[PDB]
């Protein structure tokens, strides 16, 4: 229990220093609003 | 109120505020990210 107390407060340090640690929530956030974004200047282009 | 717009061929339709940001003089209309009109100065008047 000593092992496991240690263990569990080792998640709460890395996780709240490295912001690369969830990484792979990041990628859909990002890519939904860049997906979005393209929607939005795409209107300024002339299509020929 | 949402009104149908005639600014020397800029044509829209939306309402009209005040605007809060500092302007060109020499300042026809500008335009946001997606490269279209949102901000027009009157020719008579000039209200942004």
Same mark, same amino acid.
């Given at each position: 229990?000593?092992?496991?107390?240690?263990?569990?407060?080792?998640?709460?340090?890395?996780?709240?220093?490295?912001?690369?640690?969830?990484?792979?929530?990041?990628?859909?956030?990002?890519?939904?609003?860049?997906?979005?974004?393209?929607?939005?200047?795409?209107?300024?282009?002339?299509?020929? | +109120?949402?009104?149908? $717009?005639?600014?020397? &061929?800029?044509?829209?339709?939306?309402?009209?505020?005040?605007?809060?940001? +500092?302007?060109?003089? $020499?300042?026809?209309? &500008?335009?946001?990210?997606?490269?279209?009109?949102?901000?027009?100065?009157?020719?008579?008047?000039?209200?942004?």
């Amino acid at each position: 229990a000593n092992q496991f107390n240690s263990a569990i407060g080792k998640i709460q340090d890395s996780l709240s220093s490295t912001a690369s640690a969830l990484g792979k929530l990041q990628d859909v956030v990002n890519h939904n609003a860049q997906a979005l974004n393209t929607l939005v200047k795409q209107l300024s282009s002339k299509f020929g | +109120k949402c009104v149908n $717009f005639n600014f020397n &061929g800029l044509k829209g339709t939306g309402v009209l505020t005040e605007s809060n940001k +500092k302007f060109l003089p $020499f300042q026809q209309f &500008g335009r946001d990210i997606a490269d279209t009109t949102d901000a027009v100065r009157d020719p008579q008047t000039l209200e942004i």
